[PDB]
Amino acid sequence: DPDQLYSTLKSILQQVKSHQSAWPFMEPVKRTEAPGYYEVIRFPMDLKTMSERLKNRYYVSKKLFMADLQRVFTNCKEYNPPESEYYKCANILEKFFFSKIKEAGLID
């Protein structure tokens, strides 16, 4: 259908959300749990917000989707110590993300 981009992105986002390393990214970061977070991280992003954006038909291009999801990882890696469990999850899930976007032919 015309929903080919939407269907592809929904599949990708769902697979990312089901991944066992996705648990840290599943909802917005809480100020209580992250001192200084919103002072350092200017464009917060999480997989719940991404799901809404997707449902709200925001992702009219592959580039808008890839930017949000990449941001989930890079925010985490800037904020957290390099050997933290969060930083480890980011890179695992990031590897999985780049493999899925390649599988789908979203990058050439």
Strand content: under 5%
The CA-CA distance between the termini, in Å, is: 22 Å
Please name the CATH topology. Histone Acetyltransferase, Chain A
Q: What is the total tally of β strands?
A: 0
Helix content: 55-70%
C-alpha Rg, in Å? 14 Å
- Assigned CATH superfamily: Bromodomain-like
CATH architecture tag:
Up-down Bundle
CATH classification, class level: Mainly Alpha
What class, by secondary structure content? Answer: mainly alpha
Helical region count?
5
Largest sheet data: none
What series of H and E elements makes up the topology? HHHHH
| Shape, per Cα inertia axes | globular
What is the number of domains? 1
PDB class: signaling protein
Keywords: signaling protein, bromodomain, Histone acetyltransferase KAT2B, histone, acetylation, acetyllysine, epigenetics, structural genomics consortium (SGC)
Assembly: monomeric
Entry title: Crystal structure of human PCAF bromodomain in complex with fragment MB093 (fragment 7)
Question: Could you characterize the architecture of this molecule?
Answer:
The chain is 60% helix and 0% strand. It is mainly α and 108 residues long. It has a single domain (1-108), classed as Histone Acetyltransferase, Chain A. Helix 1 (4-18) runs antiparallel to helix 3. It starts with a helix and ends in a 5-residue tail after the last helix.
TL;DR of this structure?
It is classed as signaling protein. Helices cover 60% and strands 0% of the residues.
